[PDB]
């Protein structure tokens, strides 16, 4: 193990952090714009096309 004993630690030493928990990779904002465009194009499909 490390050194001879357990490493010293602060009496609180919380440090929550954990902003991201796995996942990451694909961004959410780009696909959010994608989903907005999806509902927009569905609304367009509701509007008449051709004829």
């Amino acid at each position: 193990d490390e050194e001879i004993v357990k490493t010293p630690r602060k009496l609180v030493n919380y440090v929550p952090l954990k902003i991201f928990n796995l996942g990451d990779s694909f961004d959410d904002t780009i696909t959010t714009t994608v989903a907005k465009l999806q509902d927009l194009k569905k609304e367009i499909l509701d509007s008449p096309r051709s004829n």
């Binding site: 194009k41 499909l45 096309r49 051709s50």
Partner: protein, 48 residues
């Protein structure tokens, strides 16, 4: 015909008729282009 002011009437009439004929031909061409655009945008709608 000029003194009785009938020549200007015929001149205007023939000019308007020529404009009408040319516009009708261009209208047929526009119909063809509009149907072509209809087909292209229908293909785009299939892609959609």
């Amino acid at each position: 015909m000029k003194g009785t002011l009938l020549q200007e009437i015929t001149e205007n009439l023939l000019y308007a008729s020529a404009i009408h004929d040319s516009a009708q031909e261009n209208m047929a061409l526009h119909l063809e282009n509009l149907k072509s655009l209809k087909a292209e945008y229908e293909d785009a709608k299939k892609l959609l």
